């Protein structure tokens, strides 16, 4: 029993965190094989600024060991520093780009040293509601599949509202953001509907049933109400993904939607669900199954 | 900016997780140097759970009864001893991944990260606090026993908790790494009830300071209060008494935000009276009590 916001064990990623220093700027890098990946703003026209840098301008520190940079290239907003040594702690890994609503763990680092790990979702507006201070740039987001680390995020900046923006490991930004000091605003956020439903299933599995009702709804009727309360549209794919939880709890997805529909039109009424007075949307259907079944890494 | 419930990076603890099997029971062990620590109820059978005599059951066991698995490598047990509710299995190999560590007994209100394991394999890391009733509100399934709570400060791992049992209310009970239970609990299937839980007041105040640092000021007011008047109100909302030690601990946050502790105490009093009124504080509609004053300074 119990439901917690749980991150993947960060050990395989801690073995890859290095400190990248270029001029006055010091941020984090991801050392995989003989390449160190980091935000290209560490050099701060990026083609022009990068052509003026040499390999000895980048000071890479893996613990108390300085790595010698033997090459540098740029892939979108990520700088790739070729180093002489392959990271012996390199795990089985993949670079994946996640969709909004998908969750991942963030290993927050300062000066190439991991200081914290937390779970979070890629918001539908492509920002993450992280917790980052100066020096956290280059901190990475990841998921673990069996023994494979899927790197899905690299932190680049903080928007004026306190939310965060970054890229996948191929340097492609999530969202309409640029790695530059200019006026940038995150779009109005929406609630990740499928994740709220997954969290409602997790509450039922934990014995919290007060919100359940006899009612069911059509997907079209639910989406009319979802649009109204700034909730993301629920697709048939989402309904299918919630299938195993629906089978386990015996509550059809559209039956759980009528409960969500009522929770939105009426509220919690002083009650909580899994110790929360708000509807939690940072647990995907897969996260709920993983936590309420005990999958290990 | 931003405030999140943040756990410590679990890497140093993942390198210590092993699977301990004794008879039919399989739980997790903590392998540090040449010793594997695990809950002593790993030696328990079906009719040795309501009233087990652990000294008696342990004397009947031999080193080859304990099957220890560190990854795909079986470790050889060369000794066994019991320290309170923890079983210490001496092994023939020192863990090369043993970090700088200490065994630390924490007080209620203190926070720590939990590395949840099943079969000696870490599956997730989360953050939680030792509740005033000495239970933890974890996320644990069968086989999680022996999962450890820890803090990682300045390269060192302070182990402060080992998971032992789930109480009938879904909350969890365990011990420090010296086998001493937190709370009035025992490792027996007897009827055990957690005392009525209370809110960790100092942690709520620390979280209110964290919100002020993050630009949330809507809950602040022109009022201040006496410590006794705050405790008289707080006790009625099932909040822990705020001691002068707690007031002193909140000092640095009070200096940083320019809001006296007793002034923040009056903001809290008001929040308890009115509720949030559809508003949130750090993205939360409830007052958060699992961030200590030390955590807030750490994160901010
Ligand atoms: O509770 C137990 N460990 C679990 C841990 N965390 C979470 C759980 C969730 C579900 C089922 C077991 C859970 C065991 C087995 C069941 O009974 C006892 C009784 C005892 F006196 C002791 Cl010391 C341990 C246990």
UniProtKB/Swiss-Prot annotation, chain B:
Outcome of mutating residue 49 to A: Does not affect ability to cleave and inactivate human TRMT1
Regions of this protein lying in the Cytoplasmic compartment: 1-300
Location(s) in or outside the cell: Host cytoplasm; Host Golgi apparatus; Host nucleus
Active site positions: 41, 145
Catalysis: reaction(s): TSAVLQ-|-SGFRK-NH2 and SGVTFQ-|-GKFKK the two peptides corresponding to the two self-cleavage sites of the SARS 3C-like proteinase are the two most reactive peptide substrates. The enzyme exhibits a strong preference for substrates containing Gln at P1 position and Leu at P2 position
Subunit structure: 3CL-PRO exists as monomer and homodimer. Only the homodimer shows catalytic activity. Interacts with host FBXO22; this interaction promotes the proteasomal degradation of nsp5.
Protein name (record): 3C-like proteinase nsp5
Biological source species: Severe acute respiratory syndrome coronavirus 2 (2019-nCoV)
Lineage, top ranks: Viruses, Riboviria, Orthornavirae, Pisuviricota, Pisoniviricetes
Shown stretch of the complete protein: 3264 to 3563 of 7096
């Amino acid at each position: 029993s119990g439901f917690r916001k749980m991150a993947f064990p960060s050990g395989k990623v801690e073995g890859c965190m290095v400190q990248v220093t270029c001029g006055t700027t010091t941020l984090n890098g991801l050392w995989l094989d003989d390449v160190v990946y980091c935000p290209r703003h560490v050099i701060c026209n990026y083609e022009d600024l990068l052509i003026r840098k040499s390999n000895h301008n980048f000071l890479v520190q893996a613990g108390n060991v300085q790595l010698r940079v033997i090459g540098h290239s740029m892939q979108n907003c990520v700088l790739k520093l070729k180093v002489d040594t392959a990271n012996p702690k390199t795990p089985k890994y993949k670079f994946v780009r996640i969709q909004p609503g998908q969750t991942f763990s963030v290993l927050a680092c300062y000066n190439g040293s991991p200081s914290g790990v937390y779970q979070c979702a890629m918001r539908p507006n492509f920002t993450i509601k992280g917790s980052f201070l100066n020096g956290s740039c280059g901190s990475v987001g990841f998921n673990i599949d069996y023994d494979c680390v899927s790197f899905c995020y690299m932190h680049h900046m903080e928007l004026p509202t306190g939310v965060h923006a970054g890229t996948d490991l191929e340097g492609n930004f999530y969202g309409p953001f640029v790695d530059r000091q200019t006026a940038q605003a995150a779009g109005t956020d929406t609630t990740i509907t499928v994740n709220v439903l997954a969290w409602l299933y997790a509450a039922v599995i934990n014995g919290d049933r007060w919100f359940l009702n006899r009612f069911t709804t059509t997907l079209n009727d639910f989406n009319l109400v979802a649009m109204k309360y700034n909730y993301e549209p629920l697709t048939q794919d989402h309904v299918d993904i919630l299938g195993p939880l629906s089978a386990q709890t015996g509550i059809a997805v559209l039956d759980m939607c009528a409960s969500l529909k009522e929770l939105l039109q009426n509220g919690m009424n002083g009650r909580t669900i899994l110790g929360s007075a708000l509807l939690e949307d940072e647990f995907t259907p897969f996260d709920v199954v993983r936590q309420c079944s005990g999958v290990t890494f």
